[PDB]
Write a protein that binds this ligand. Structure first.
Ligand SMILES: Nc1ncnc2c1ncn2[C@@H]1O[C@H](COP(=O)(O)OP(=O)(O)OP(=O)(O)O)[C@@H](O)[C@H]1O
Ligand SMILES: Nc1ncnc2c1ncn2[C@@H]1O[C@H](COP(=O)(O)OP(=O)(O)OP(=O)(O)O)[C@@H](O)[C@H]1O
Ligand SMILES: [Mg+2]
Ligand SMILES: [Mg+2]
Lengths: 473, 473
């Protein structure tokens, strides 16, 4: 025994799976949006509004949904943002395809329409965007703040916004006639007992070591660094192992190193600087050293009051550390998850120097270009392009409907404001119900994240259409 | 206990099996055609439109269908194309035989009709086709492109089309007063990190070796090649095994070889070229060597920046390698499955120098010859030949019906266009709904694949008729 299902009934059964997976996410479309409660088989309780999190702990019985979710998860590791937008948009394009199938259009006309709209949308995003550079640091601060905000740690402590902006403004490499960065170049340190304004940047590389040995010179300058993975006969062996302590000095003097860090007593003779205990790799990347004596170099090393050790002016100038100290664990452990995602959004601007307004300002310029382009295509395909435009505007209703407003009128006001000339940045504010200019409010996101949202939605829906039949064996 | 079933009811039960197996395939008749989803017993999901793939993972309860599928699978290994056409045509000839049995004609009249139509069809294909040669490289490019297209790798990167055309235009042997080729003569290499336009031909034989030993002369010219499957007493054995390293030099000097490849250190003394590690068979076929020292010969050997090793101008000039490097695995692994099937279609033209238009242009010349021939046969057999012609035209409805068009009118327009003189290449375009000239659009397939489609369909249906009774024990 096995089941075969084919034709319109298999296509309806696939669309009813996509409109279920989108229904699970619709309400959490941020900001100012609801959370979901997830309970596991053990009885743990979790509260979340992070879509990449929900899609790993919800569980899905239907195989076509299992393909849609896999595309939306694959979407999160390539770019890091737009996990929910690429599911909502893929929900709307299917819901509006259902209106075209009742007019008896064949699916290969619809799919040819969508893949003919997406290529004029991606051109329009590159046309309406505006360029930005590292020197435009106000715009970098506005992007950081927008990605950072809506948690307890926020731009009420705007020191966090300058902290991240300065930290990646330091690490700028130049490649492809453009700037380049990666998160491997900038490191955190996390500890408890502190304050969120006590967190600081350094322009140096730092470890929260509570001890280094007391006789040693706690300031070292214009210096060389080494990073290391390095009865009667019983008394002779015991001495031979105590002489192996002096063999550390013997081989440091063989190379002239000043501070010497080893993975895992005779420290009075060394004092006549040792660090007791993947971080040696970070020190090597800062110092230019290597983990037989190969040395690295730095302008200053210090230990200072909890208690800490600092390296400053290491040979590679494009490396930075930041330290978070907070009074409770719950603050620190989510502040990392906010702060490095903010920095990893600034990096999505800096890797490609365009920026576009949030708030639904992009969708309504796209929904104008399509409705001016559709009369040129003329055939049955014209109904598929106009059915695409109605599905992109249908996104910002899910943004207005979510902040308590009346959705239809607060769509019509925006569309009428865009029929006037210029005005291209008007969109929804969400902390007051009226439309406002999104650039002067400073609400911005990088173009690469919108392009990935549009492309992963069209790729996901044109794989749910264009399945005729289901066989199992 | 056992079952016996005989007469009209056994014949109806066989035809209802053939019209089920054809019903599973009808919609995927390409291009621009739907896919099917196949789920296995483990829970893996697969999406496909390749008929030779569907028929191995669908599973079939009925024994007559199990014979039809076995003929259609056997069809794919002899010629490589026409797995679906030979099932659809075998579906139509049975569906139209059912209309003749209700007029009470006996089955041995029908089968005598079909086997009397197929012999005038095979003559007509040899009459209406047009010849082609290697020098007609535009037609080779058009055939390559038609077989290559409708994937992400396509003639948007037309470098792939010239890549394959040049690659088999080099390997041409002459036999039977005709050209001859096989796929054993041309080899690929596949690696990750690349681009689809970074893929290149060579007119040489190549391995993506990331290393060869650093002292050795990395350029060798007008050269000879060897291809090889080749306490106190403990110190004497250890030395005897180290002298066996120098015995490689000792036996290379005994034959004067310049580069020496062995299946599975003293390389400084060899340097005073060694390759560290079925490919020795390919090198032997290029070099004219053999895997006791038999040597092969080549004009140049080089190692160059990833990193690679090249052999150029080997003794046999009718051997070629191509290299695919792509930025992701998913691209490379299906690009092989497209690119070698494109090349293995050019080989189906070159092995037999006729070509015929696609798009349903052949079917409507055959459906004219039959309806002019049928009045000569005169008896009850006349109804079986005209019932054959209606079943070949009934194929291009499944091509028009599939691209969203209205099927009947877009048949009648083609038939009326063929009642005019010449025009013999008019057929369906599928990227716009009107008929167009298929030769100027460049849509071509080799005659040997159509002949195998006609012959394997008539052979499959005349075995489903002409079964009277089913016995089991
Ligand atoms: N201050 C704001 N005012 C208006 N719209 C905003 C504001 N901040 C963000 N948005 C909009 O919120 C949407 C993104 O919603 P949300 O942040 O919940 O999902 P996401 O970040 O894409 O998801 P994920 O982080 O899981 O990938 C975009 O349309 C964006 O422009
Ligand atoms: N560009 C085209 N326009 C019109 N018809 C085309 C075009 N390309 C191919 N065809 C037609 O498509 C049919 C073959 O369909 P399809 O390629 O799906 O099956 P197949 O190649 O025979 O199957 P398989 O590859 O599994 O053996 C032939 O009638 C051919 O002439
Ligand atoms: Mg976001
Ligand atoms: Mg084919």
């Amino acid at each position: 025994g096995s089941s075969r299902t084919y034709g319109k009934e298999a296509l309806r059964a696939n669309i009813a799976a996509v409109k279920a997976i989108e229904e699970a996410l619709k309400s959490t479309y941020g900001p100012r949006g609801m959370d979901k409660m997830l309970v596991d088989s053990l009885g743990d309780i979790t509260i979340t509004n992070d879509g990449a999190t929900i899609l790993d702990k919800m569980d899905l019985q239907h195989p076509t949904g299992k393909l849609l979710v896999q595309i939306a998860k694959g979407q999160d590791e390539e770019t890091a943002d737009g996990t929910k937008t690429a599911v909502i948009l893929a929900g709307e394009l299917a819901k509006k395809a259902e209106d075209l199938l009742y007019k008896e259009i064949h699916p290969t006309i619809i799919v040819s329409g969508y893949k003919k709209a997406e290529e004029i949308a991606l051109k329009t995003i590159q046309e309406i965007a505006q360029p930005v550079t590292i020197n435009d640091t106000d715009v970098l601060r506005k992007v950081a703040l927008t990605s950072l905000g809506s948690k307890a740690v926020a731009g009420a402590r705007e020191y966090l916004a300058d902290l991240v902006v300065k930290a990646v403004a330091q690490v700028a490499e130049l490649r492809g006639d453009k700037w380049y960065v990666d998160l491997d170049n900038v490191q955190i340190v996390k500890k408890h007992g502190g304050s969120v304004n006590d967190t600081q940047l350094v322009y140096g590389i730092v470890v929260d070591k509570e001890v280094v040995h007391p006789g040693m010179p706690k300031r070292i300058e214009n210096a060389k660094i080494a990073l290391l993975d390095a009865p009667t006969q019983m008394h002779k062996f015991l001495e031979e192992e105590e002489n192996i302590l002096k063999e550390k000095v013997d081989k440091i003097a063989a190379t002239g190193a000043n501070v010497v860090i080893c993975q895992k007593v005779a420290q009075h003779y060394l004092a006549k600087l040792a660090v007791r205990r993947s971080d040696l790799e970070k020190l090597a990347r800062a110092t230019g050293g290597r983990v037989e004596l190969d040395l690295g170099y730095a302008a200053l090393v210090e230990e200072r009051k909890d208690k800490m050790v600092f390296v400053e002016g290491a040979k590679n100038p494009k490396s930075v550390s930041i330290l978070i100290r907070g009074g409770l664990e719950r603050v620190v452990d989510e502040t990392e998850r906010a702060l490095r995602d903010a920095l990893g959004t600034v990096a999505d601007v800096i890797r490609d120097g365009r920026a576009v307004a949030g708030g639904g300002a992009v969708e309504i310029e796209i929904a104008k270009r399509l409705r001016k382009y559709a009369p040129q295509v003329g055939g049955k395909e014209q109904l598929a392009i106009e059915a695409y435009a109605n599905a992109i505007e249908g996104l910002i209703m899910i943004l207005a409907e979510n902040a308590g407003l009346d959705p239809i009128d607060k769509l019509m006001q925006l569309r009428s404001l865009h029929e006037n000339e210029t005005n291209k940045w008007y969109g929804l504010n969400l902390f007051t119900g009226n439309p406002e200019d999104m650039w002067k409010l400073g609400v911005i996101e990088p173009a690469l994240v919108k392009m990935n949202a549009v492309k992963a939605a069209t790729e996901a829906v044109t794989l749910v259409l264009r399945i005729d039949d289901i066989v199992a064996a």
